[PDB]
């Protein structure tokens, strides 16, 4: 549940999506499914805990159910997921950057106001103007 705490508003609404193990939005669920899994297990071990749920009917017990099929997302990174970008704009970038991570910053960007900065300071204008300065 440590991830479910880190919850920075809409941050974990995508986090649950990104390292998944779901079933195409998952029928009757929910996100996370990893909230139920440790409730099924009952940490740490604990004999009088993972039996409970199996008797009514961590990872292997979770794999033992389960809504597997789908297969969407992977990481942890993966995706899904006057000057400006520019040129135009993809990404991958077609003017500045990146030696990414920087790539990733152009995909959340579009569109279409310049500056700002937001979050906030303060180098997206500088790297832009610096990129225009070499014609």
């Amino acid at each position: 549940h440590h991830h479910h705490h880190h919850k920075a508003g809409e941050a974990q609404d995508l986090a649950e999506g990104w390292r998944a193990f779901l079933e195409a939005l998952k029928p009757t669920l929910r996100a996370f499914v990893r909230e139920a899994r440790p409730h099924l297990e009952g940490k740490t071990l604990v004999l009088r805990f993972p039996e409970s749920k199996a008797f009514h009917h961590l990872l292997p017990l979770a794999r033992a159910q389960f809504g597997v099929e789908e297969l969407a997302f992977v990481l942890e990174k993966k995706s899904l997921s006057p000057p400006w970008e520019a040129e135009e704009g993809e990404d991958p970038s077609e003017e500045l950057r990146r030696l990414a991570r920087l790539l990733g910053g152009r995909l959340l960007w579009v569109r279409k106001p310049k500056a700002p900065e937001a979050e906030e300071p303060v180098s997206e204008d500088g790297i832009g103007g610096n990129g225009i300065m070499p014609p």
Binding site: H4, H5, H6, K7, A8, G9, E10, A11, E119, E120, P121, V122, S123, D125, G126
Partner: protein, 874 residues
């Protein structure tokens, strides 16, 4: 009265010397004429008897003790003793720390045995004759150290024991006379008049020509010298406490101060002159620190630190002082003093006793001689005194041939000249007093006893020249030995238990915000983490969980003392707090109000439950929810119906580090993870004078130089008399009081206030600013290339490799070189080569760490950019 003093001595000697003075040994002594029965029987008699029975063997300890009791009884001070250790042994028994002793008091074996003193006086070179001169009837002045907190309790004990009417505390400028009169505050020229004597009276005071300039100054100086003698008013002495036999009202008149403490109208010298018993109760902080040291060590690892049974030859303790780690080590924190211990490399306790005694303006010149003799690179010779050698050596070997302590000179006088150790005390008095021709009595007296002992009277006179020289700066060993023990205890706790020692330091000075900030950064740069508070794991005060320092709940600003306890007590009867909802439903607003809840989130005590911006929005909603759950439970019900379990946390976007650390500053008092400045590290590199390194760097430069400095602004002022705003620039290494005086030119024109970074050109002598640049002014200004090369590079290759690779990429960027030398970070701007902003990446290909840092030389002017255009990107 004399018999009970003997009992307590014989009882004491048994517990202080277990291996040596045993029940068996006491029985023997009875035979030549229950354990408590023997001490009882030995008291009874009797001087005539004891007399007949006339390294430190078991027989020697008795003779010493028997001789001191003989002196104390005869001079009539057994009652005085019994009073002293009563409140000291009470203090120990009622949880009040008592120091090992100060002054000469530690020299007495009786004092040590019974329990006034807590350092072995016969193990070290401590003498009773220094404490009480047997050949002169004078009252001894016993001073005792206590914990500064619990000092009043020991005085309160005395007030109840000896009577309220018989116990009370004793009562207690030239520069001020000129000013204080005028003040009733600015001067401004009045200070320049009183700066002539920064004080001695105007009776003497050679720049008196200022008087006849103005007729105003003529009178004021003449009036000020007439009002010098007044002693101000009346007040209480720190340590002074008197215990009279008959009621004080019968002899000495009394007062009562603002705190209700009974105060004598006479001063120390006036009260002693009447022949009344005086006692000094000093308040020491090291004892307070050592109390918290024991409790945290026992809480962390279940160890009972017995300070009075520690080994005095622990290897880790001395090699820690040898490494110059005396950050919080008592009596040893000074700058030069710290350096002196690392050079000396102390291995035994006597090294610290000598070092502490020698380190002061006067005997300090002998320290370098001591260090070479100690480290084993200079023979200890006594060739100048061959006949006297056999007497001098056993005295001076302990301190490598250097008369350091007062007890040595007394020993050297007593043995060589054949004096009594009592009258060797008198000889020290005469050398200090420097009586014109009276010490020529001691010269010839010394010579007679010298040559009868063996010295050929050529050495005897020159030996006396040595004594009188070192007598001026001869220090008292008893005091130095006792206080050195507390230094060693302090060092001992640090060496073996460094986390809780650091947590103790934080605990003691938890109120001062500057010290806490200093102690955290010392802990962070020593491998010891310092985490924020936490409702699940933190205690009331600072705590050591595992090997990590952890802030207390009391350290949070808005959280009450009752709240701090209530939160803790709720956790004990119930479980650990599982969620935010669980917390505020078990702890109602009644106890932990919304104001305190907000400050608990900002402090980070609820970080286990989630994001702070999310938790701060979820407060009132969950407060309503928690208010509703009680109303249901307060009407029968049970569970499922009585509780719709806590909703999901009320969403909110996470906090940026600027506002997050700003909340942390409001919650506790200082920032959590150092910073913020180093979030943009491009400026940290520039730092021409780091806040710590400012004094070190600026002094070896021209007369009152100039230098640029960055940090974070944390103060708001403006003007007028103008523009005179005092801001404080703070770094991760410290802070500074920066002006904000030159700005009225005008004008630097900040208007920045808290929570924004700046760069500041300033003159130093205190620092006085002139020009300023914000983060975007720095980042826009033309940048320059900077490589950081290590020391490892030979010159006769010859360093052409660095020059060859800089040649191929011309352009217009000044090249800077950071050479991390053996001592000091050097700054080296290059020469002719100007890079073209392609050589950064192509250089990082090799084993060099390049940067695109802002050019230092650019920071000036108010055009080209300009300052308007540098505000646009922000």
């Amino acid at each position: 009265e004399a018999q009970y003093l003997r009992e307590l001595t014989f009882l004491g000697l048994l517990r202080r010397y277990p291996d040596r003075i045993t029940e068996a040994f006491y029985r023997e002594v009875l035979r030549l004429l229950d354990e408590r029965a023997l001490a009882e029987a030995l008291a009874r008699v009797e001087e005539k008897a004891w007399e007949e029975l006339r390294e430190w063997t078991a027989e020697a300890i008795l003779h010493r003790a028997l001789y001191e009791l003989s002196v104390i009884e005869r001079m009539g001070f057994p009652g005085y003793f019994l009073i002293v250790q009563d409140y000291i042994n009470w203090a120990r028994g009622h949880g009040v720390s008592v120091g090992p002793g100060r002054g000469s008091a530690a020299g007495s074996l009786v004092a040590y045995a019974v329990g006034i003193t807590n350092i072995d006086p016969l193990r070290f070179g401590l003498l009773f004759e220094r404490f009480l001169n047997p050949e002169r009837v004078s009252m001894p002045d016993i001073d005792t150290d206590f914990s500064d907190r619990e000092r009043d309790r020991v005085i309160q004990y005395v007030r109840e024991r000896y009577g309220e009417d018989k116990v009370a505390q004793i009562g207690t400028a030239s520069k001020a006379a000129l000013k204080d009169v005028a003040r009733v505050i600015p001067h401004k020229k009045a200070e320049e008049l009183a700066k002539l004597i920064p004080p001695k009276p105007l009776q003497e005071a050679e720049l008196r020509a200022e008087m006849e300039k103005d007729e105003r100054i003529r009178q004021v100086i003449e009036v000020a010298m007439r009002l010098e003698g007044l002693n101000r008013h009346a007040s209480v002495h720190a340590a002074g406490v008197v215990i009279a036999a008959e009621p004080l009202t019968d002899l000495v008149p009394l007062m009562r101060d603002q705190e209700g403490r009974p105060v004598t109208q006479y001063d120390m010298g006036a009260v002693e002159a009447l022949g009344l018993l005086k006692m000094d109760f000093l308040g020491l902080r090291t004892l307070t620190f050592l109390d918290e040291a024991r409790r945290i060590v026992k809480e962390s690892k279940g160890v009972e630190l017995d300070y009075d049974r520690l080994p005095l030859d622990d290897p880790k303790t001395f090699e820690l002082l040898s490494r110059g780690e005396t950050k919080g080590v008592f009596q040893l924190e000074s700058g030069g003093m710290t350096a002196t211990v690392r050079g000396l490399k102390p291995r035994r306790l006597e090294d610290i006793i000598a070092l502490v005694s020698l380190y002061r303006p006067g005997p300090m010149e002998h320290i370098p001689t001591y260090i070479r003799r100690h480290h084993g690179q200079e023979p200890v010779s006594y060739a100048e005194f061959p006949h006297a050698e056999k007497y001098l050596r056993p005295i001076l070997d302990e301190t490598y041939g250097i008369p350091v302590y007062q007890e040595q000179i007394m020993q050297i006088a007593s043995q060589v000249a054949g004096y009594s150790l009592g009258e060797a005390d008198l000889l020290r008095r005469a050398m200090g007093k420097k009586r014109v021709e009276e010490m020529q009595k001691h010269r010839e007296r010394f010579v007679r006893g010298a040559k009868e002992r063996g010295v050929p009277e050529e050495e005897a006179n020159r030996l006396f020249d040595m004594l009188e020289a070192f007598a001026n700066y001869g220090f008292n060993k008893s005091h130095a030995a006792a206080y050195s023990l507390l230094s060693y205890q302090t060092a001992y706790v640090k060496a073996h238990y460094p986390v809780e020692f650091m947590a103790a330091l934080l605990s003691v000075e938890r109120h001062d915000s500057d010290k806490v900030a200093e102690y955290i950064r010392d802990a962070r740069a020593l491998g010891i983490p310092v985490l924020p508070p936490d409702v699940n794991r933190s205690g009331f005060d600072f705590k050591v969980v595992g090997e990590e320092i952890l802030f207390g709940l009391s350290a949070v600003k808005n959280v009450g003392e009752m709240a701090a306890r209530a939160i803790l007590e709720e956790r004990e009867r119930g479980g650990p707090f599982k969620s935010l909802g669980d917390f505020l439903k078990r702890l109602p607003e009644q106890v932990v109000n919304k104001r305190a809840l907000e400050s608990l989130v900002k402090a980070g005590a609820l970080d286990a439950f989630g994001d702070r911006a999310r938790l701060l929005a979820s407060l009132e909603p969950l407060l309503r929810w928690a208010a509703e759950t009680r109303e249901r439970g307060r009407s029968g019900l049970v569970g499922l119906f009585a509780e719709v379990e806590e909703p999901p946390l009320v969403e909110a976007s996470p906090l940026d580090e600027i506002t997050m650390l700003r909340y942390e500053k409001e919650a506790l008092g200082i920032y959590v993870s150092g910073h913020p400045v180093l979030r943009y590290p491009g400026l940290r590199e520039v730092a021409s004078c780091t806040i710590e390194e400012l004094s070190e760097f600026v002094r070896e430069l021209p007369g009152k130089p100039k230098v640029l400095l960055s940090g974070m602004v944390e103060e708001v002022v403006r003007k007028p008399t103008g523009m005179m705003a005092r801001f404080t620039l703070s770094d991760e290494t410290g802070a500074l009081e920066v002006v904000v005086f030159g700005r009225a030119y005008e004008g630097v024109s900040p208007k920045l206030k808290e929570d924004i970074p700046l760069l500041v050109l300033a003159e130093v002598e205190r620092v006085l600013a002139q020009a300023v640049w914000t983060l975007e002014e720095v980042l826009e200004a033309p940048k320059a290339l900077e490589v950081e090369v290590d020391h490892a590079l030979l010159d006769e290759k010859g360093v052409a490799r660095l020059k060859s690779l800089l040649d191929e990429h011309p352009g217009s960027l000044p090249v800077y070189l950071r050479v991390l030398g053996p001592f000091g970070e050097a700054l080296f701007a290059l020469r002719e080569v100007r890079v073209g902003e392609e050589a950064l990446g192509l250089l990082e290909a090799e084993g060099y760490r390049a940067y695109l840092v802002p050019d230092r030389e650019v920071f000036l002017q108010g055009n080209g950019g300009g300052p308007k255009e540098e505000v646009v990107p922000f």
